[PDB]
Every structure is written in structure tokens, then in C-alpha cells.
Design an enzyme around this catalytic site. Structure first.
Site, mmCIF file in Angstrom:
data_model
loop_
_atom_site.group_PDB
_atom_site.id
_atom_site.type_symbol
_atom_site.label_atom_id
_atom_site.label_comp_id
_atom_site.label_asym_id
_atom_site.label_seq_id
_atom_site.Cartn_x
_atom_site.Cartn_y
_atom_site.Cartn_z
ATOM 1 N N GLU A 1 0.917 -1.184 0.121
ATOM 2 C CA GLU A 1 -0.012 0.093 0.086
ATOM 3 C C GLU A 1 0.656 1.343 0.066
ATOM 4 O O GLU A 1 0.618 2.068 -1.053
ATOM 5 C CB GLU A 1 -0.797 -0.074 1.345
ATOM 6 N N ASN B 1 -8.246 8.778 -5.028
ATOM 7 C CA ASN B 1 -9.614 7.996 -5.346
ATOM 8 C C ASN B 1 -10.369 9.085 -6.294
ATOM 9 O O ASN B 1 -10.696 10.006 -6.048
ATOM 10 C CB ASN B 1 -10.503 7.934 -4.184
ATOM 11 N N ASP C 1 -13.521 8.775 -7.295
ATOM 12 C CA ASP C 1 -14.976 9.276 -6.767
ATOM 13 C C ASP C 1 -14.841 10.646 -6.344
ATOM 14 O O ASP C 1 -15.705 11.311 -6.630
ATOM 15 C CB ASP C 1 -15.340 8.029 -5.658
ATOM 16 N N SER D 1 -12.163 11.438 -3.571
ATOM 17 C CA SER D 1 -11.649 11.507 -2.306
ATOM 18 C C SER D 1 -9.864 11.099 -2.447
ATOM 19 O O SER D 1 -9.534 10.886 -3.514
ATOM 20 C CB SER D 1 -12.184 10.397 -1.460
ATOM 21 N N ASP E 1 -6.366 9.188 -0.365
ATOM 22 C CA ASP E 1 -5.939 8.532 0.960
ATOM 23 C C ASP E 1 -4.615 8.944 1.457
ATOM 24 O O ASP E 1 -3.676 9.114 0.814
ATOM 25 C CB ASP E 1 -5.885 7.104 0.649
ATOM 26 N N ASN F 1 -8.923 6.472 3.256
ATOM 27 C CA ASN F 1 -9.824 7.442 2.413
ATOM 28 C C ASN F 1 -10.166 8.446 3.176
ATOM 29 O O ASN F 1 -10.631 8.457 4.467
ATOM 30 C CB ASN F 1 -10.905 6.448 1.806
ATOM 31 N N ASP G 1 -15.476 -1.760 12.780
ATOM 32 C CA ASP G 1 -16.881 -1.531 12.073
ATOM 33 C C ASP G 1 -17.625 -2.907 11.635
ATOM 34 O O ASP G 1 -18.684 -2.729 12.160
ATOM 35 C CB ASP G 1 -16.575 -0.617 10.895
#
Length: 129
Positions: free
Chosen positions: A35, A46, A48, A50, A52, A59, A101
Site C-alpha cells: 500500500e 480516489n 470518486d 476522495s 487516501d 480514504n 466497524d
């Protein structure tokens, strides 16, 4: 800042991340390895709308916020830039919260297939601590 294997291992241990909820350093190193390669600067983007930030790549829409992400929610309630500290403590603090989560790491693309189905020793072998 950058984080070598042994340093990151000692850091992940001082933070209580090794085997945290089962996530052994092998998972964290393998994930962080491809990563950001243990780096508090390797940033990703990102489409969309966004971005990171943070060694483990977080994100700014569902994990954290940066103040510029075109529409962000934030489930970690934390400032993304802070994830780039010289101490993994920033990302580790949000990670230790995010990994609770329900999806856990079943999202980070690298860990998803490069680790969640490969090996968890090649990312710790050596720093036997």
C-alpha cells in the site's frame, strides 16, 4: 517519514497492533508494504472524489477527512493529514478504531488479495520480536 520492517515491528508492538483483533504484523506489514511501503508520505488518489493519506492509506470520505475531499463523511472522526505523522501512532490510533466497524481490513485492496490469502511471515520474518 519512512518506517523500516524492524522499526515498524517495534512500533506496531508498542502500539499493540501485532495480533490486534488477530491482525498480526504480517497482515499489517503485507498490507502497508504494497500500500505505502511503510511510508508516512506515499499518498494515493480516489477517482470518486476522495484521497487516501496515512501509512496504511486511509480514504478521506469513509475513514477520515482532510477538509478538501468534495463531500466527506468521516467514520474515524479524525484528520487525514495527521495520519502522515512520523509516528504510526496517528494511523494506528485511527486503524485500531477503523478495524472495528464490521468490514475490518476487507477493503484495503493490497491486503484484500496480496495478504488475505497469501502469507503472513514474509512481512515479519527476521524482526523476530
Amino acid at each position: 517519514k519512512v518506517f523500516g520492517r524492524c522499526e515498524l515491528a517495534a512500533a506496531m508492538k508498542r502500539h499493540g497492533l501485532d495480533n490486534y483483533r488477530g491482525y498480526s504484523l504480517g497482515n499489517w506489514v503485507c498490507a502497508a508494504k504494497f500500500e505505502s511501503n511503510f511510508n508516512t508520505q506515499a499518498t494515493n488518489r480516489n477517482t470518486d472524489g476522495s484521497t487516501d493519506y496515512g501509512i496504511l492509506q486511509i480514504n478521506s470520505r469513509w475513514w477520515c477527512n482532510d477538509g478538501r475531499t468534495p463531500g466527506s463523511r468521516n467514520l474515524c472522526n479524525i484528520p487525514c493529514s495527521a495520519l502522515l505523522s512520523s509516528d504510526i501512532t496517528a494511523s494506528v490510533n485511527c486503524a485500531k478504531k477503523i478495524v472495528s466497524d464490521g468490514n475490518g481490513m476487507n477493503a484495503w485492496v493490497a491486503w484484500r488479495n496480496r495478504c488475505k490469502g497469501t502469507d503472513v511471515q514474509a512481512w515479519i520474518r527476521g524482526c523476530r520480536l
